[PDB]
Design a protein around this ligand. Structure first.
Ligand code: NA
Length: 348
DNA sequence: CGCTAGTCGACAT
DNA sequence: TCGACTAGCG
């Protein structure tokens, strides 16, 4: 995600405990729990051997949140966004290597170094995620599989008032316009919360605490959607936005060499890349739990054209979207693997 | 100072 | 995966 964002705005953070959300609703990026739980049993998962330690690992977190009187909404990743469809695969292959290498590193005796090999080959499948989903439903905990990336979905759940805070390890949530993000939370409840409103507590941030400018900064610094121009980090991007008296971001990016007083040349496809990135942060498709409909993260502004935003996710039928969201329909094969019905007993 | 890429540890015995 | 941390260079 946004490389080095947390340290950049550490002044806006605060050590908290989950009890401050007792009697309120919190959405969870379940992937972090799934991964941290999968580390404990990477060996069995790599060899294909049966294991389910990650289920219990997630469930102790769930039971903790429930013990402190909090209503958790588990959120999962869905279809891979086209913008990263290569990237993920570019990661995928590497995992395979760390499998083929890893096992061979066990043939040389080095099990200590094979640890890092098998732990860097972990692939969180939809099956494992669904096992966790069943394990959560058995405890009466609502779940929700995002149409695509879970970040946008969580951001929506928080900006809609459905949840008050979001538990995750990804800082990208901030660039999506999240209000309250709880980072680094152990199995006991000790966490680190960052609020959007308190982004002004960061001196080096300047006046770049507004959501739009902050987003521009995050994108310009380098993200999953668009690699940053070489030599551009959070600081110099922030400086560009501070020295800019211009609302139109395109002309500003074209004048980056003027704002940084450097010889920076901007490729004309990088402009389009920035536009696509911004449109992805703004209008990535998410699922509305209440209205049961595929909607963009934010309402389409008048200046944008929804017909040209396929890279931000494609629309499907709202019923199918519902079946995906409930985790009944497989992300890949589009086949029914379950039949949960919330009616016959999040979705008001 | 600031940015890149690269290593490194996570879990837990 | 994803942040943390650092050497190396503009
Ligand atoms: Na960068």
């Amino acid at each position: 995600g946004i490389q080095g964002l947390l340290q950049f705005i550490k002044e806006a953070s605060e050590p908290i405990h989950v009890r401050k959300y007792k009697g309120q609703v919190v959405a969870v990026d379940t992937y972090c729990w799934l991964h941290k739980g999968a580390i404990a049993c990477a060996e069995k998962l790599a060899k294909g051997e049966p294991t389910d330690r990650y289920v219990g690992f997630c469930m102790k977190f769930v039971n903790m949140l429930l013990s402190h009187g909090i209503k958790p909404i588990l959120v999962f990743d869905g279809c891979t966004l086209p913008s990263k469809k290569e990237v993920e695969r570019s990661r995928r292959e590497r995992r395979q290597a760390n499998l083929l290498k890893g096992k061979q590193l066990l043939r040389e005796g080095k099990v200590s170094e094979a640890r890092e090999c098998f732990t860097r080959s972990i692939n969180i499948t939809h099956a494992m995620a669904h096992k966790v989903i069943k394990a959560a439903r058995s405890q009466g905990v609502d779940c929700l599989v995002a149409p695509y990336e879970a970040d946008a979905q969580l951001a929506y759940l928080n900006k809609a008032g459905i949840v008050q805070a979001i538990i995750t390890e990804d800082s990208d949530l901030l660039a999506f316009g999240c209000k309250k993000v709880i980072l680094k939370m152990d199995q006991f409840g000790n966490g680190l919360e960052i609020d959007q409103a308190r982004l002004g507590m960061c001196r080096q941030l300047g006046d770049v605490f507004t959501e739009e400018k902050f987003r521009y900064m995050c994108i310009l610094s380098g993200c999953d959607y668009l690699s940053s121009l070489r030599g551009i980090g959070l600081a110099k991007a922030c400086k560009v936005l501070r020295l800019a008296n211009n609302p139109d971001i395109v002309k500003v990016i074209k004048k980056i060499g003027h704002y940084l007083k450097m010889n920076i040349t901007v490729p004309e496809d990088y402009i389009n890349g920035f536009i696509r990135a911004n449109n992805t942060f703004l209008y990535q498709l998410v699922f509305d739990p209440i209205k049961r409909k595929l909607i963009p993260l934010n309402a389409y502004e008048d200046d944008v054209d929804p017909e040209t935003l396929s890279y931000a996710g494609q629309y499907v039928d709202d019923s199918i979207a519902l079946q995906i969201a409930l985790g009944n329909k497989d992300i890949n094969t589009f086949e029914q693997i379950d039949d949960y019905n919330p009616d016959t007993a999040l979705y008001f």
